[PDB]
């Protein structure tokens, strides 16, 4: 798995409300967050299942 996967949800500066996916590295699997819609960063997926195929790791 990248290690941008290990990074925590960034909303970022923006407020819509989107809601995406995130890895969340101690629980071993994706969460739902609420981007903001600018700005993101890269451990942000629109599903569950792209989420984990990136870094749901080997």
Do not use: H
Not at 37 to 46: E, L, S, V, Y
């Amino acid at each position: 798995r990248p290690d941008f996967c290990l990074e925590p949800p960034y909303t970022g500066p923006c407020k819509a409300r989107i809601i995406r996916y995130f890895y969340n590295a101690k629980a071993g699997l994706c969460q739902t967050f609420v981007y903001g819609g600018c700005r993101a960063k890269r451990n942000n997926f629109k599903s569950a299942e792209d989420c984990m195929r990136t870094c749901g790791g080997a």
